[PDB]
């Protein structure tokens, strides 16, 4: 007398409906009370192009104001081929390279995460330290980790520095879990971060494709090489980021 039938409820459909309301969080951005000044225009765009469950990341580039070398103005965010989960974001080993960024210095990276947390993530220390160990252009005293956590109806930002001991731990860490061994809160400090309207930042995106590989993670490996171009990134669920969903009606 039963005869009930399952009909799939693919969850990227539900999450894609949420991403279209992300723009409302850009009216409720909060910053936690060297110095780093984030321009609002690229931050708002970075929020909208993102996802509520899958983390996304972007590299930070900037330059100190003329006579004021103790503050770092963030002038550019670079989106590189990536995929993410709710705990990390898998970047390629190759750091951005472009003529435009040569006049600037690298200031670290900014990523989103689902829930706020009073502590910089352990796999976040591991990420930052492992980048520093492969790229001496990341100073440690000048590169930060700006977290963008999806608090209810909002967006709160926090900027962390790595410590010397946090660096030496993160390089050697292999446990990718959320409570690995030798993890200690003395691996990071907070740093001053300000959101400003006085200048605009700009984006650089990949040249031969886009940045979002979360719907095609197999064609993404840590050794992948990419060029860049002066242009703005596409939203998370844009067509070009999931062509299978469109082309797989040639079977239906």
């Amino acid at each position: 007398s039963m005869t009930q039938t399952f009909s799939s409820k693919t969850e990227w459909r539900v999450r894609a409906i949420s991403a279209a309301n992300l723009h409302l969080r850009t009216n409720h951005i909060y910053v936690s009370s060297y110095t780093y000044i984030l321009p609002k225009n690229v931050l708002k765009k970075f929020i909208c192009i993102s996802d509520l469950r899958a983390q996304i990341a972007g590299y930070l580039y900037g330059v100190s104001p003329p006579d004021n070398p103790q503050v770092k103005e963030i002038r550019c965010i670079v989106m590189v081929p990536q995929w993410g989960t709710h705990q990390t974001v898998h970047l390629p080993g190759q750091l951005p390279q472009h003529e435009y960024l040569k006049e600037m210095e690298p200031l670290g990276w900014i990523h989103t995460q689902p829930n706020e947390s009073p502590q910089l993530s352990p796999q976040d220390v591991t990420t930052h330290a492992k980048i520093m160990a492969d790229n001496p252009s990341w100073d440690g005293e000048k590169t930060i980790i700006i977290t963008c956590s999806f608090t209810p109806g909002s967006c709160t930002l926090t900027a962390y520095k790595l410590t010397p001991s946090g660096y030496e731990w993160g390089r050697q860490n292999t446990d990718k879990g959320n409570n690995p061994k030798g993890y200690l809160p003395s691996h990071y400090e907070r740093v001053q971060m300000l959101l400003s309207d006085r200048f605009l930042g700009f984006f650089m995106v990949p040249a031969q494709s886009s940045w979002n590989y979360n719907f095609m993670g197999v064609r993404h490996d840590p050794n992948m090489k990419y060029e860049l171009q002066l242009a703005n990134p596409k939203e998370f669920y844009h067509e070009v980021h999931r062509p299978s969903h469109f082309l797989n009606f040639a079977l239906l």
Binding site: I17, K45, L200, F202, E239, V240, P243, H245, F249
Partner: protein, 1712 residues
């Protein structure tokens, strides 16, 4: 007035549409009888009989004979056509012809067509394609195509073209210029005339045929009412008639239809009952009573079989089913049970039965069956149509397309059901009336049947209806009350209805209105308040009120119930133009927002009111959830929402899924037919709102809908001509499509791994549209950036894929790619598919300076076809902020007594007692010093008085000094000349002269003139020759006025001459004083520095100091369609007048000649609506009639009588004077002037309104922004220093132009040079004059210019990146090197040793006659030893000087038949090149033809350059030694002067000498001016029947006619020196003292006789000596050449004028 009730329109609606039955009983013909059967009832109606033939048929031989080709191969008009031919062909009367279907109405329509075709027959060629258009309105699309070929075949002998109207926008306007009869559907013609602002082609409509006009009763009926009311009302407001022809079925209310068509019922109404059917019809109706689901279904098949059995073998039976699916099925079900036994010939069927194969078909033929529907191949039912026509098919089961689109008759017709599924209603409904009549109308073949048999099977409840429809008893009602809001909005958007009064008047033209009068009970009205409102005035006002309120609630219109006024909106216009119901447009208005996902866009589309009847049926949630489950755009709403269903069908249609539900595929078709224009509405809304992200999404959705694919599909799929399947090949190789351009042919065959088609993919890879972009950033200020975008195509054109054009959108987006800072529509035509295109625009910039903008150019039609150029500003050099102005010091105003010269004071003290502050500050420096002075102040500052000061100073120093005054515009010059003629000539006894074209004249004006007024070009031609002319270097004062125009289009000439006067002053070392006046310049110091003005002598005043304070207001207007935008400015113009100057004079500038008349009338209608009628007339209607006795403009006098004037280039010279007079006197309060007149208006106003700031360019077919200089000049008219404490100005612009106007009106103006783009003709002049002798001279020369100074102050603007000293000698050198090589390549200069430049002969001719160096180059190629008077015109027309002769599609036609009348028919005519228009205008001039007044003003500019070009040729032919063509061009100069051909008679030069006069004198023995000059005195007054005043005119010409007897002698003739000198002396002596110039009344400028003296060998075609000669009294001229060897040669002399014909002397002489 006053609407008193808000109706519920939906209650008034006839719900059943054309199935509404107004008649409650239906009477049948006498033989009718009813049966009764098991489950169905049967009504039989017997065939009628013709009625006893009471006039005779018309032999085609008696039709008018211009009309007999339309009836080629025809005998005799049938009965109907014979009753109609006199009304159709011999009168213009509107007609309404009601006849049974196929009674012959279509030939009656040709007869009307043929009468209009006749209106443009001369014997000429034969028909004038250009004067008219004919509109045939047919209900069905299938009907249109048949009629296009049927009418085209019958009229192709008339050379006219009949064409269908494709659904396109801008490609379907091309086909209207070419066709005379346009066949279209009601809705297609409605869409086109809803825009009309194109400068329409619909003004040529002379005839409108409305076929099947009983469509009025259909849901589509209101389209017909909208069309007629618009036409008839347009007849009122233009007074050119349009003939209307209605053809309808024979149904009740036809007389009301005739009232609605304005048909005189006693002249144009013709009703032929169904007894005039071609073949009598035996009718059978079968009304099934079974309400059981599918026992009714097989009862139907039972009735079908029995009826089809009655006709087995005897007659073919066309069975009508109502879906392309039911054709095959019903046709086979019949054949299925006919297996019991059959009744037949057969292998002509079996032969083609699988010669041709096609599923089912002799599964559906055995017993001659067939189907016919729109899904089958063209030929797979072409002569399947015609297996039937050969009587070979026995049963044909078809749909209604065959009835409408193919003339296929059959003895028996069976309409199976009457039920059809209607997606618009989301429901099964009955067929439309047109379909039923059309199908049954196909019963009974023309010849072979004595009766057709029509069988209709339907539900028994519908019998009375179908009985009524087929027996003249279903009345034709109006369905428009529903569509009234939409229709009314269309008339508001057009400006046809501006208030509810207009709308009530408009409504009275509707068919609805007629029906409401005749039958008020049917239409909710009411016998007992009708008679209390007999015109239904209150009723109409109430309906219009209800509609207005609905339109106001949905934000389409702004309606206030007090005024009853309507106000168009952009949303309103979009709803009308995209044919979208207004409820939909409000939904878009509220849901559309820039933050929109593609998820939410798809949802917004699915909520359009066009889909308000769609539902999710239970038997539909099958696929609807299967598809929704995984569809690429998620759908938030549940399956139970019909919005989700529409969403799924749209995406399924794009993915090309094919569904299984029968209604769902039908619903999918309706959804996506609408999507195209609905989605384009959204695109236009969001694009014009600036929403960069949404604009990109919507335009994508348009293209996806159009091409049925997603972006993620390889864009090669779009190559329609593509049967490859080899991109799913490519698509599974996921790699960037942009990468295939890099690579060759074979590697593609390797990436996709199909070797054989590597080349074909490569071919289509580069057929795909691809543009490359480069950008030149040009900073204007620190806040406004000018951008030059160069588009370079990078693909191959191919009309098989691209057609004639490819459309692109250029999009300038900001940093975050979310605001469109600028956008424009770019069209790449196939003629220029291989050229770079230059685009310029302005964008705003701020000084923290954004990292970059972006420039996108995306295909309008091609998916995945876009190029984005990042425009970064990291290296943008901004200019420096402008310095503060010169402070205006609070000096007490200087009195005119400070001139200390009573004579000088006689020029001012009558008018004003004190000079203004600006004049008071500069006075001392100007009057009491010789310093070079710059005065920069707002226009209207009395800047010209300051120059008068310097002239007065000169007159004291020199008493005979020369002053050259330059102003940039010829209208300003002529106004300066009168005011300065009064002052310095009349009241000071100096000489004031105003230069013309003629250098010979102007040279003497420079000697005698104490002050010379000149435009730039006229001084350039003369100042070039300054080393030869003392008069040019002996100039005390040089005044350049309005100098800020160096930055405008004509700046470079003005910049060259000023620098020349600066350079001359250096060479002569006796300085020339320079005074420069200017509008407020931000970079004033650069101008002053360039002209040598000490900083204390540069007065840089900014706008704030204008002596009469200016109140500038800038109103922004949101509508982007300029015609609608103008409409939304109409009333705000009148409101500005009452707000800012309800009493004091107002000038309104409007963009075009046509607009002056319209706005003047508009202002008056609004004035009379204020019931302040004539509030602008301050004199009585009495004082005006002495003025109003010149009505050469009939409408200006109605305007003047109500207080308004208008001014444009078309009014007579003194017409403009009288409007100006009445204006400046105060009698006329308002004058509406065109934009072109803004430079020569002799009046001023308290308030200036600028109505829009763009004008249409006829040449480039695009709207151009007003130059900023013109706007400054218009605003300066709001300045009355004697009468007003203030000047006010309102600028109404497109909102996108507002910020620009505030920036460049309030702040002083920055001006740059554009001489770097104008180098050749001036470098050529300085190499001729030896100022430039080597490439270093060219560099030194550039540094005198204004271009130099600005290079260091704004390098990026001139394409510099550093102001280093070597950077710009590098730059200056490059400019020198490329200008000299071009000049050297074109053979005007020679370059020696990579360094030395010197003039060649061409260069001398070009510089001498002020002729562009490329004009003289084509002269040098084309001119040759043989070409004569004909080819000369051909090569002069091609001059660059005539490149910018305007071309309008209006006279794209008068010249088509002008080439018919010119003596010299022309090489390969193309007809929209200016060079052939100039060719024909020149030929039309020598033949004394009078053209348009527009073609007249066109010609007067052509002739203004002709003499220079003609003389350039004579100078070229002679130095090459060619005798015949040189003399030929010398007589062309006299030809173009007196307007003649050389074959004409010499006496055609005399005044009043006309056609017959010359024959009267050739008859007597006189053929010369000298033969007249003395025949016995009164023996001529009796020979010319002419007025004594006319005789006096003939005498003056004879006395100015040259009377020189030439003396020739040769020096020392005894000397044959075998190759030495041979001087020969010629002396010229006239008898008179030529008091006056050449008398040539048909030449625009005054000339003076120019003479050539030629030595040539007549036999050799060999010119030897040549010299020009101006002559009066004394003249001795010497000619010399080198002798030949032999002692036996004779030459012939030639005395040749360039003005008069018949004075050419000729002596022969052998000088050994």
């Amino acid at each position: 007035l006053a609407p008193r009730q808000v109706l519920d329109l939906e209650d008034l609606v006839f719900t059943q549409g054309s199935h509404f039955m107004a008649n409650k009983r239906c009477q049948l013909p006498d033989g009718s009888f009813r049966r009764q059967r098991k489950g169905y009832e049967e009504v039989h109606v017997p065939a009628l009989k013709p009625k006893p033939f009471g006039e005779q048929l018309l032999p085609v031989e008696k039709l008018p004979k211009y009309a007999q080709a339309g009836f080629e191969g025809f005998k005799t008009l049938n009965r109907i056509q014979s009753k109609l031919y006199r009304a159709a062909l011999e009168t213009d009367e509107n007609l309404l012809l009601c006849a049974p279907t196929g009674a012959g109405k279509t030939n009656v329509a040709l007869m009307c067509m043929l009468r209009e075709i006749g209106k443009h027959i001369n014997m000429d060629g034969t028909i004038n394609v250009c004067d008219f258009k004919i509109i045939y309105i047919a209900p069905m699309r299938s009907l249109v195509q048949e009629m296009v070929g049927s009418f085209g075949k019958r009229l192709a002998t008339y050379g006219i073209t009949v064409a269908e109207l494709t659904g396109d926008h801008q490609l379907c306007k091309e086909e209207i210029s070419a066709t005379q009869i346009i066949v279209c559907t009601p809705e297609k013609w409605d869409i086109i005339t809803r825009k009309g602002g194109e400068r329409t082609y619909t003004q040529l409509v002379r005839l409108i045929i409305l076929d099947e006009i009983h469509l009025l009763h259909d849901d589509r009926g209101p389209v017909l009412e909208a069309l007629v009311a618009r036409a008839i009302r347009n007849i009122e407001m233009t007074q050119e008639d349009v003939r209307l022809i209605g053809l309808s079925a024979t149904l009740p209310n036809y007389e009301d239809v005739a009232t609605f068509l304005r048909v005189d019922p006693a002249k144009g109404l013709f009703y032929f009952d169904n007894s005039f059917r071609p073949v009598p019809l035996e009718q059978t109706y079968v009304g099934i009573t079974e309400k059981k689901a599918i026992k009714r279904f097989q009862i139907m098949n039972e009735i079908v079989y029995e009826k089809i059995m009655e006709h087995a073998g005897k007659n073919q039976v066309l069975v009508f089913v109502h879906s392309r699916k039911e054709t095959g099925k019903t046709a086979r079900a019949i054949r299925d049970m006919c297996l019991e036994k059959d009744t037949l010939s057969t292998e002509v069927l079996r032969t083609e039965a699988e010669q041709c194969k096609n599923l089912e078909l002799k599964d559906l033929l055995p017993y001659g069956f067939a189907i016919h529907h729109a899904g089958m191949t063209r030929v797979d039912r072409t002569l399947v149509e015609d297996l039937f026509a050969d009587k070979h098919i026995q049963v044909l089961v078809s749909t209604a397309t065959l009835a409408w689109g193919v003339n296929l008759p059959a003895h028996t017709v069976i309409i199976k059901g009457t039920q059809v599924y209607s997606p618009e209603k989301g429901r099964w409904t009955e067929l439309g009336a047109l379909d039923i009549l059309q199908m049954l109308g196909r019963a009974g073949r023309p010849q072979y049947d004595t009766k057709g048999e029509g069988i209709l099977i339907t539900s028994h409840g519908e019998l009375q209806y179908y009985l009524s429809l087929l027996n003249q008893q279903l009345p034709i009602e109006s369905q428009m009350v529903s569509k009234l809001p939409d229709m009314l909005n269309a008339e508001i958007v057009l400006g046809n209805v501006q208030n509810a009064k207009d709308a009530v008047n408009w409504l009275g033209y509707a068919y609805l209105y007629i029906r409401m009068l005749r039958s008020p009970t049917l239409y909710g009205i009411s016998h007992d308040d009708l008679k209390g409102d007999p015109l239904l005035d209150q009723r109409r006002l109430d309906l219009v009120h209800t509609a207005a309120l609905m339109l106001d609630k949905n934000n389409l219109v702004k309606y206030d119930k007090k005024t009853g006024n309507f106000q168009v909106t952009e949303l309103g216009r979009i709803a009308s133009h995209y044919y979208i119901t207004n409820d939909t447009v409000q939904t878009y208005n509220q849901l559309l927002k820039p933050t929109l996902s593609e998820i939410e866009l798809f949802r917004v589309f699915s909520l359009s009111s066009e889909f308000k009847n769609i539902t999710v049926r239970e038997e539909e949630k099958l696929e609807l959830q299967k598809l929704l489950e995984r569809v690429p755009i998620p759908v938030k709403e549940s399956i139970e929402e019909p919005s989700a269903k529409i969403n799924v069908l749209l995406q399924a249609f794009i993915s090309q899924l094919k569904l299984e539900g029968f209604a769902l595929m039908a619903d999918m078709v309706y959804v996506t037919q609408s999507a195209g224009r609905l989605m384009r509405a959204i695109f236009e809304i969001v694009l014009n709102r600036g929403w960069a992200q949404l604009t990109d999404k919507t335009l994508n959705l348009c293209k996806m809908i159009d091409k049925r694919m997603w972006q993620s599909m390889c864009p090669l799929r779009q190559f329609r001509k593509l049967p490859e399947e080899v991109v799913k090949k490519i698509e599974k190789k996921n790699f960037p499509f942009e990468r295939l351009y890099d690579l060759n042919h074979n590697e593609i065959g390797e990436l996709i791994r199909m070797p054989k088609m590597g080349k074909t993919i490569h071919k289509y890879v580069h057929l795909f549209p691809k543009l490359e972009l480069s950008v030149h950033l040009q900073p204007i200020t620190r806040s406004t950036l000018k951008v030059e975008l160069t588009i370079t195509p990078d693909f191959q054109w191919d009309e098989k894929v691209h057609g004639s054009s490819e459309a692109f959108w250029i999009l300038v987006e900001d940093v975050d790619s979310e605001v469109i800072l600028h956008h424009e529509y770019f069209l790449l035509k196939a003629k220029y598919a291989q050229d770079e295109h230059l685009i310029t625009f302005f964008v705003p910039v701020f000084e923290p300076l954004p990292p970059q903008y972006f420039i996108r150019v995306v295909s309008d039609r091609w998916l995945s076809c876009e190029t984005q150029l990042p425009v970064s500003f990291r290296h943008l050099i901004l200019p420096e902020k402008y310095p503060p102005p010169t402070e205006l010091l609070d000096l007490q105003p200087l009195p005119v007594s400070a001139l200390r010269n009573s004579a000088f004071e006689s020029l001012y003290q009558d008018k004003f007692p004190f000079f203004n502050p600006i004049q008071t500050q500069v006075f001392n420096t100007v009057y009491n010093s010789d310093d070079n002075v710059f005065v920069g102040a707002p226009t209207g500052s009395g800047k010209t008085i300051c120059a008068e000061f310097a002239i007065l100073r000169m007159l004291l120093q020199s008493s005979e000094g020369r002053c050259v005054y330059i102003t940039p515009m010829e209208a300003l010059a002529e106004q300066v000349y009168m005011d300065w003629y009064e002052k310095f000539q009349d009241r000071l006894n100096k000489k004031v002269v105003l230069l013309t074209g003629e250098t010979s004249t102007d040279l003497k004006l420079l000697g005698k003139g104490n002050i010379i007024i000149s435009t730039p070009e006229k001084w350039d031609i003369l100042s070039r020759r300054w080393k030869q002319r003392k008069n040019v270097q002996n100039i005390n004062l040089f005044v350049v006025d309005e100098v800020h125009l160096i930055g405008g289009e004509n700046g470079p000439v003005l910049e060259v001459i000023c620098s020349r006067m600066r350079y001359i002053s250096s060479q002569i070392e006796r300085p020339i004083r320079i005074v420069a006046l200017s509008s407020s310049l931000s970079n004033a110091k650069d101008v002053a520095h360039w002209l040598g003005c000490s900083a204390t002598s540069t007065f840089n005043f900014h706008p704030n100091v204008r002596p009469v304070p200016l109140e500038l207001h800038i109103q922004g207007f949101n509508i982007s369609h300029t015609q609608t935008r103008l409409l939304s400015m109409a009333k705000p113009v009148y409101h500005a007048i009452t707000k800012h100057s309800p009493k004091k004079p107002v000038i309104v500038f409007v963009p075009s000649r046509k607009q002056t008349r319209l706005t003047a009338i508009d202002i008056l209608t609004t004035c009379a609506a204020d019931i302040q009628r004539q509030r602008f007339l301050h004199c009585t209607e009495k004082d005006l009639i002495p003025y109003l006795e010149k009505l050469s403009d009939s409408t200006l006098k109605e305007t003047l009588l109500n207080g308004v004037g208008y001014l444009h280039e078309g009014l007579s010279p003194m017409e403009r004077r009288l409007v100006e007079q009445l204006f400046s006197s105060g009698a006329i309060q308002v004058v509406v002037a065109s934009r072109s007149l803004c430079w020569g208006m002799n009046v001023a106003a308290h308030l200036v309104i600028i109505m829009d700031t763009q004008y249409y360019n006829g040449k480039i077919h695009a709207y151009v922004d007003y130059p900023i200089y013109d706007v400054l000049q218009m605003v300066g008219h709001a300045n009355r220093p004697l009468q007003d404490d203030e000047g006010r100005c309102v600028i109404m612009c497109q909102g996108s132009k507002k910020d620009f106007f505030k920036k460049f009106l309030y702040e002083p103006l920055p001006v740059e040079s554009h001489l770097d783009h104008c180098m050749h003709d001036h470098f050529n002049a300085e190499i001729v004059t030896k100022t430039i002798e080597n490439k270093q001279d060219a560099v030194d020369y550039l540094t005198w210019t204004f271009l130099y100074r600005r290079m260091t102050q704004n390098p990026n603007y001139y394409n510099l990146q550093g102001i280093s000293h070597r950077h710009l000698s590098d730059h200056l050198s490059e400019l020198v090197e490329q200008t000299l090589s071009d000049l050297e390549q074109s053979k005007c200069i020679s370059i020696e040793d990579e360094m030395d430049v010197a003039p060649l002969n061409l260069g001398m001719i070009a510089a001498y006659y002020y002729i562009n160096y490329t004009t003289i180059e084509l002269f040098s190629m084309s001119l040759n030893a043989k070409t004569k008077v004909r080819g000369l015109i051909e090569i002069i027309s091609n001059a660059a000087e005539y490149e910018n002769i305007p071309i309008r599609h209006h006279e794209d036609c008068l010249l088509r038949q002008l080439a018919q009348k010119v003596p010299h028919k022309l090489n390969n005519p193309k007809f929209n090149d200016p060079h052939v228009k100039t060719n024909l205008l020149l030929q039309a001039h020598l033949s004394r033809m009078q053209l348009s007044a527009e073609l007249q003003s066109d010609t007067e500019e052509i002739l203004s350059k002709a003499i220079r070009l003609i003389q350039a040729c004579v100078d070229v032919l002679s130095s090459n030694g060619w005798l015949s063509p040189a003399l030929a061009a010398m007589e062309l100069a006299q030809m173009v002067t007196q307007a003649m051909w050389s074959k004409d008679s010499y006496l055609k030069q005399l005044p009043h000498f006309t056609s017959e006069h010359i024959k009267r004198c050739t008859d007597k023995g006189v053929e010369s001016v000298f033969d007249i000059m003395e025949m016995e005195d009164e023996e001529r007054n009796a020979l010319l029947q002419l007025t004594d005043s006319q005789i006096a005119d003939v005498a003056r010409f004879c006395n100015r006619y040259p009377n020189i007897e030439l003396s020739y002698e040769v020096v020392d003739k005894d000397s044959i020196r075998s190759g030495g000198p041979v001087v020969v002396l010629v002396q010229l002596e006239r008898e008179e003292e030529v008091t006056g110039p050449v008398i040539a009344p048909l030449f625009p400028q005054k000339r003076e006789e120019g003479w050539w003296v030629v030595i040539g060998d007549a036999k050799s075609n060999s010119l030897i000596s040549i010299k020009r000669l101006t002559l009066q009294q004394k003249a001795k001229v010497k000619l010399d050449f080198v002798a030949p060897a032999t002692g036996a040669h004779n030459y012939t002399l030639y005395f040749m004028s360039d003005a008069y014909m018949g004075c050419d002397q000729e002596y022969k002489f052998s000088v050994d």
